[PDB]
Design a binder for this molecule. Structure first.
Ligand SMILES: [Zn+2]
Length: 103
């Protein structure tokens, strides 16, 4: 995917939840049906309605020209490393931990 700058659209707290983000993809175009809206939205992205351009609900990063085989989370991390949503996902503070012992 490619970073989009100077995109002349804005997202009309609305997109904090997965369901709202997924719903944005009602008009996701035919030529990108292979990059799942379900993965895109999980990865924080909202469809802007312009081309195949999606925008992160948290960092405002925009990506378009999605290509076969692109991983939305990896594209997110590569392009927008200071995103607070990604950093929250990298946090191990709130997560259930399984501990191995061979003692
Ligand atoms: Zn982001």
């Amino acid at each position: 995917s490619m970073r989009v700058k100077n995109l002349k659209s804005r997202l009309r707290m609305r997109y904090q939840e997965e369901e709202a983000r997924l719903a944005s993809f009602r008009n996701w175009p035919f030529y990108v049906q292979g990059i799942s809206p379900c993965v895109l939205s999980e990865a924080g992205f909202v469809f802007t309605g312009k081309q195949d351009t999606v925008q992160c609900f948290s960092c405002g990063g925009c990506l378009g020209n999605w290509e076969e085989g692109d991983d939305p989370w990896k594209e997110h991390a590569k392009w927008f490393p200071k995103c607070e949503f990604l950093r929250s996902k990298k946090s191990s503070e709130e997560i259930t931990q399984y501990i191995q012992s061979y003692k």
